[PDB]
């Protein structure tokens, strides 16, 4: 009879089987309590702030070959040292040593993105202004 029970008074056994067998998706723990809050860099949050420890040049994965220009951002709440990408061409030139920044997820719900190994957070804002604005030269980096 196709494995599972088809008793009229079973129900219990069915629901318990589901409760057992539901555990096969990382997203299932997110809905109960949150893996984000116990482990993980971003504490159940979309974006996260931090301070730039150092500028980095990451070797891209094959078949690609380049140096990707990233930063070790130590966060403010948790204090975890996390790698982070710098979007657009140049833009590593705008950021300095020990500046407040704002990070966001790279796109793929955690995890890597394309040829970049390890890094999973794109930089959005630096010293209270967007990278995009700095790049296009609409607004400038406030020194004071």
């Amino acid at each position: 009879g196709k494995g599972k029970p088809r008793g009229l008074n079973s129900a219990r056994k069915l629901r318990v089987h589901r409760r057992n067998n539901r555990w096969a998706e990382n997203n299932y723990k997110k809905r109960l309590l949150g893996t984000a809050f116990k482990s993980s860099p971003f504490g159940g949050s979309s974006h996260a702030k931090g301070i730039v420890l150092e500028k980095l040049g990451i070797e891209s994965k094959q078949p690609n070959s380049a140096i990707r220009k990233c930063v070790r951002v130590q966060l403010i709440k948790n204090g975890k040292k996390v790698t982070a990408f710098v979007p657009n061409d140049g833009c590593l030139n705008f950021v300095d040593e020990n500046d407040e920044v704002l990070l966001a997820g790279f796109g793929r719900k955690g995890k890597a993105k394309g040829d970049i190994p390890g890094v999973r957070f794109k930089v959005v804002k630096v010293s209270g202004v967007s990278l995009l604005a700095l790049w296009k030269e609409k607004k400038e980096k406030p020194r004071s």
Binding site: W23, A24, E25, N26, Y28, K29
Partner: protein, 97 residues
Amino acid sequence: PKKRASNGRNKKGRGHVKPVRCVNCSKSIPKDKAIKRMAIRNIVEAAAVRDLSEASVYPEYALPKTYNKLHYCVSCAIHARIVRVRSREDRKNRAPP
């Protein structure tokens, strides 16, 4: 949560039977697998049959045969013995010649 992996493919037998070592190379092997041949030859060859018959005391004589059952290890069977390898259809057939 919970997540892992793998397994594989198939053939038929019976239960268990004891092995009989390879007559050539001393590898162990059961008897559903086996690969066996009956060595049933005369002591004398085709060349020797006359030279003997001539020198034979007793009229009619005898000329018996050395009988023995030889068991191979599949590996060794293909090394020499009549087994070789057959097509997709021919490997279903069981007739000897």
